[model samples]
Target: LPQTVRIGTDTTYAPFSSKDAKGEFIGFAIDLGNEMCKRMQVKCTWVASDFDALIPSLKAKKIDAIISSLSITDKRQQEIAFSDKLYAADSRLIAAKGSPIQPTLESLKGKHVGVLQGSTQEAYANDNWRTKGVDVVAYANQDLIYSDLTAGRLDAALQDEVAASEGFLKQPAGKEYAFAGPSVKDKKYFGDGTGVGLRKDDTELKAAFDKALTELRQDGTYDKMAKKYFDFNVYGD
Candidate 1:
């Protein structure tokens, strides 16, 4: 009997994964997940789980794969395997437009910065900004962080460039915000692009996803989906 493929994800990330008004999961990751299913010739079930819990769930056999916008970090590599890079992203600091404070570490000194807990951005902010006397505030999700930012509770927020652009800057209130400073691409913290998370032993599945992703990128499907949300091709430079 064929096993049912289960792809785990957090539906709270907008422009990546989220539940639409029609109550269906839709976004870049969801589209990529469906594409992988099409290539593998299998039906997939999306299992909604907390972002922090996705890897553990995969280890526990609750899901067969993870198609969330999961970073491919060495820490994660220690526990599980991942597919080839699907999209490349860098961290950016965002603040109200025309705000005196820029996105540089020096500019953020003593300022309250928001980041999603248990994320690469959080790790980067803690190690680089907070350690240097900057105030770092952690949130469970991006929306909550943005809410506090708009409410004047936070001076700025650090997140992926794509998310900051499509999910926040493109919105009405976000029009008041702008990205600052040079992008952070510390591989030790941010890892390399987004990839599919799978069990260490799921070599076959990982290869399958990698193959499918390559084909999608070659044939323009991947680039099309990327441009639908972002201004540039996120999968490439």
Candidate 2:
């Protein structure tokens, strides 16, 4: 008999993974995982983890796969494998509306910029801004960065565009803040797109996931679920 698949995710990004008003775990990623499991005829189980621990937990066999909005990048490819791109993972910088700070190293010199820990956004900052006199502070979750940004502790915060928009920009606590500059999907860091993460040895599982996702899209299931959260096209062509 097909056993329940232990899936890992960080319930921090909204419309993707986060808790509802009732404190139940529910979001795009959660629903997507459930649908995928149904299509695969396997029971689904969730493993809540920090984004930093997801890969390590998978390696430890604590989870069978990660469906977190984990972007596919060359750096990550060196360590683990990924399914086909699930969605876009473009990153952007957000600051209080009318804040003069832009997304450049020179402009942000000595200013504290926040990014989620263990994220490609952090890697981008470390490579492009960290040693260039930019003060990069990484938080374990998005709420911390948003909290710090709201408290004036950070000049700007970098994260996924959709996450910033729906998760923070549209929320009451995020009303005063807005995107500061052009969105960045610089291939050097973000890579192909977001996808499922599995151990390097799980090629069969990866194939299964890829097939299920394709079928879901073909059957218009993806559009139906996406419409529940977004009014625009979240799934790329």
Candidate 3:
């Protein structure tokens, strides 16, 4: 019997890996993960866990891989392995419509900003804007971030462009919000690409995931899946 390929994820991102309309777990990444496991001929198991604990779960063998919307960073690469690029893009700042608040420190001075806890967006806001007088607030999930953004507790929020668009900006609560500034990215922080996470020793498994990812894209299933949730390219520039 084949061992189940346990993939860990967090339900913090909508249109990617959050609850569906009926509150069932479903999203592009969830579909993508199952498809890849099917192609690889493995028993796939989806495990929901905290975003910050995903890597630790993999390390502890509680999960075999991480399918969460995790970015591939140098800091993380040293701890875990990443398959070939799944998706990649820069971050953006979201704020009330026509707000003068840009993503820069000068613009966000004395303003409160929200980001998912343990996310690169949090790191970016902390490293750059907060140091220069911005108040970086970290939330455990997108719902909370958007909640505060909607309630006016947050002056702005920082998140991935696609996630921010799909998870908040295009939603009813986000009609008052808009992308505040140009996309922000730095290899040092934003990462090279978004990819599946594996343990450092899982080289063969990584290769298998890489192959399945490429096959899906080459065969058009990737595009088909992405088109269901996004009008823009999720594969990145």
Q: List per-prediction Cα lDDT, in the order shown.
A: 0.85, 0.89, 0.86
lDDT of 1 by residue, 132-211 (tens): 99999988778788899999999999888787887788877699888876687687998988899999988888888888
Residue 52 lDDT, candidate 2, scale 0-100: 88
In order of lDDT, best first, we have 2, 3, 1
How many backbone clashes are present in model 2?
Answer: 0
For model 2, the superposed segments whose C-alpha errors exceed 4 Å read none
Ranking 1 against 3 by TM-score, winner? 3
Span of ten consecutive residues with least summed lDDT in model 1: 228-237
Q: Between the candidate structures 1 and 3, which one is better when assessed by lDDT? A: 3
* Reference-based TM-score of each model: 0.92, 0.97, 0.95
* lDDT for residue 45 in candidate 1, whole number 0-100: 92
lDDT of 1 at 220: 87
Compare the candidates by TM-score and give the number of the best one: 2
Tens digits of per-residue lDDT for model 3, 99-153:
9988777888899999888888988888888788888898877778899989999
Q: What's the C-alpha lDDT at position 162 in model 1? A: 80
Candidate 3, run of 10 with poorest lDDT = 1-10
Question: What are the candidates' C-alpha RMSDs?
Answer: 1.8, 1.2, 1.5
